[PDB]
Every structure is written in C-alpha cells, then in structure tokens.
User: Fold this.
Amino acid sequence: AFAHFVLIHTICHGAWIWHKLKPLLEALGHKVTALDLAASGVDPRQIEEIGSFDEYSEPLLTFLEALPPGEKVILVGESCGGLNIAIAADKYCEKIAAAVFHNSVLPDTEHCPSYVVDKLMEVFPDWKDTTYFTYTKDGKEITGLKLGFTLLRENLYTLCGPEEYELAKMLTRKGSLFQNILAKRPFFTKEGYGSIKKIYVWTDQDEIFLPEFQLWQIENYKPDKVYKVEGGDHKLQLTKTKEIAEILQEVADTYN
Amino acid sequence: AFAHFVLIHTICHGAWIWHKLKPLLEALGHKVTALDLAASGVDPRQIEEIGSFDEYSEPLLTFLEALPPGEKVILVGESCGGLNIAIAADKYCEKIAAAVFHNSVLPDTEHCPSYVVDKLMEVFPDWKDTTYFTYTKDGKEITGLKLGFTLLRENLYTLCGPEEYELAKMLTRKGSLFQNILAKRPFFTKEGYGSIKKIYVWTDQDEIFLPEFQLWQIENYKPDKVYKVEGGDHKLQLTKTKEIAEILQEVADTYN
Assistant:
C-alpha cells in the first residue's frame, strides 16, 4: 500500500534532515511532505517571535487543515517532534492514520505535557557546548537554545558522515523546547491524541535519547508497536535510512 | 600551503551547497568560511527587502571587513557568485589573494556590470518551470525568481544524487539577479576587481552555463588560469568535489 507521510523535524532543525528518507519513500510509491515548523529551516520567522510549542507547530496544523475530507496521513516525528504530533492529534485526529515516533519524545495523557521533557533532562542533563538565552513572549520568559557543535558531532550525528554533520552546522538554528510553557499547558486529550495508533522506533545506540530514557518512555505509555533498529545513531533517517523506509512501508501496510 | 577559502553560493542557494566541499578542504588543512548571502540560506531577510546585488552581497562584505590587517582569503564563487566576487574586490582588494570562478559569471571592467548576465540569458533563454514575480525596492522594479524544480533536476543538478536534488528542492528560496540594477551600476574598477588574480574552473558538461557561454566569457576577459573539469554537472562541488578540492589546493600553493 501507499501512504502520505508527513515528516516532522525536531527543534533547531528543519525539513532538510529528511533529505535522504524522502526520496527513498517516494521510490516506494508514497507521497511525502517534509515541513519546516515555525522559525525552523527556511521558515521566515525567528524563534523570539514564537511563544509556545503550539505556535511552533503552526505549519503542521495549517497543513493538516488543508487536507480535504477523507484524506489521512501518517505522521513521523523525530526527537522533540513527538510533541508536535500530540498537539496535531488533539486538533486533527480524524486525519491521522498513525503516528511514528523516531527516537522521539512520547507524550502521554496522564501527566502534564512537559513530563517526558522533564525526564529527558534528568537522564541527559549536560548538553555540552549548547548555548542558552532568554526572550519574553506573551508575558512569559522562554529559554532558547542553540545546539552546540560538539554535541551535534558526538551525541546527535555520532555516526553520520562529515558532509551530513556539515549540513547540521550550517543549517541548525536557534530554537526552544518551551519547557515551562508545556508545564502549564492543558494535558493532551484521551479522545484525540490518546486515540491514535502509535509506533515507536528507536536504537539503543542513541547517544542523546539514551536507552534508559527510551525504555522508560515505552513503559510509561505503551505503544501499539515497537521497532528497534540495530546500530546507527540518533539520526536514523541519515544512518539507517533504508531500515526506516522499510519500517514505514510496514506501517503503511498495517494502519490506514 | 594552507589558505582561508571563502565559499560564495549562487542566487536562490545558500552555504548548504558547499556541504561536501567544506569538510574536504578542511581535511587538507585549510580554513573555510561558507556564507549565507542576504535573504539566502538561513539568513533572516526575505528577497523583497533587498534592492541590489551590492545589498545582496552584504554578508560577504561584512565578513571581509572583519578580517584583521594582513589576512588574505581566496574567494570561490559558483554560478552568479562571480558578481559577488567583483563587488567584494572593489571594496577589499587588498584582502583577496585570488578569486576562483566555479561555473560562474565572469564580470569585466570594460562593459557594464550586467554584460555577462545579458549574454547568459541570450545563450540560455528558457528557464523551464522557473517562476517570476516583481517587487519594488528603493523606487525600482525588481524581478524575483524561484528556480523551477524541473530546471533544478535537469539543468543544475543533472548528475547529482536524489538526496542532493532533494536538498535543493527543500532549501532553494526566492531570489533575484537584479539584472536591471546591475545595468545601471557603476562599472567594476580596474584598480580593484581588475587587479585580482582570477582562476576560471568549468565543465563543458554544464547544462545551464553552456559551453558557448563559458568559452565566450574566457575570451571576453582572459583569466590568469583556466581549469576544465571533465564530466560532472553545473554543481561540480557536489559531482566532482574531490577534483574541485585538488584544484583549490593548487590555487592555494600558487597565489597568496
């Protein structure tokens, strides 16, 4: 079967992270959309204009709003993109055939939206040469970050080639996790986000979303299906592109 | 010898086009700077804010201004980047050890700045599915363009892999050649631009800067040195990265 995949990058990244996976999925016959979220990739906004994870998610929500009735997509979110998935599923659940988490945060419906982010920082407290700043938007102080180049090399892009690491140095931008805004946000809903099918894809060789964290997430909120990819790194769409495409084909054949 | 190379992308592109060449040059021991020009790559400006090729060139001029006295760079410009080189050399000639043209426009000092652009459009009049628009800045009508995806596939990225073509689809932006603004600009100077050493690199397999055009440019304004790269495509920094690095090493060993 063929599906329409919507690929959702993480904070400080853009659609460009999907540049290997998108053509491979198209070569299987799928339709692929790879979005830039707000203030990401070649989006014209700067992060200081963005006040929440919901606002950050606007391009995904706008896309989903534009789907004609009856068209369903498979969302694929990497790293912090699982939060964009949860936000989207609470507006457009009827348009989502399934959601695939790719070394991603896995929010739940029992705890507040920041819960898994809070846990991630416990497990991975030291972001190396990452820099931080503050800005104010809609009366709240937001912590922005710029991912450190050593962090990128060693922990995110560990096994990626030098030309892929170079893209990350060139293209990663200032962003935010909006952690304190998530902490005050209404909970993700059981009827919306809770009802979607959730497929969790990971590698135990991830040097930032470490095994303790990922296995904690799987026990916290049981996925419908778990795929463990052997080897690779946090950026499986770069280091294990073929394996990711194979998994996504199986998801397209399972959930519609 | 080692050099400091400053890599200058073409219109509608960004530093990302250099993502393969930059690490290869660093692996030879060089220092490399790959800039986003105004309204290009992850630069925060939109093209409608930009009124001339000189304004478009601001990041390059600002960079050069920041070099301490005595530091000299080798400029490397692809495609329309030769115009940025000429503009830079008329402000900062003493900071330029040499300029390398990489399937690039080669402006002169005898004719007005638009001359080689005018010629290019004669030789290559049909930009396929490229779209155009107008905007007004500083009382002039400017023609903007967005490079067509068929043009990108067939004429710019002819022999590039699908993951490189994908980056171009994701990352190319609206831009402008500022052709009518160039046509009214003061001529490039003999003392400045005319005095720099100029190395012209090309392939006769380029499907946009066709051989008639490139050989016309070489006869119009004789380079100090010409290198012809066999095979490849317009994006030699993607299809012949190793060969380009080899040439640049020789330039570093020749001109300081």
Notes: The interface with chain A takes residues 14-16, 19-20, 22-23, 27, 34, 41-42, 44, 46, 162-167, 170-171, 173 of chain B (CB under 8 Å).
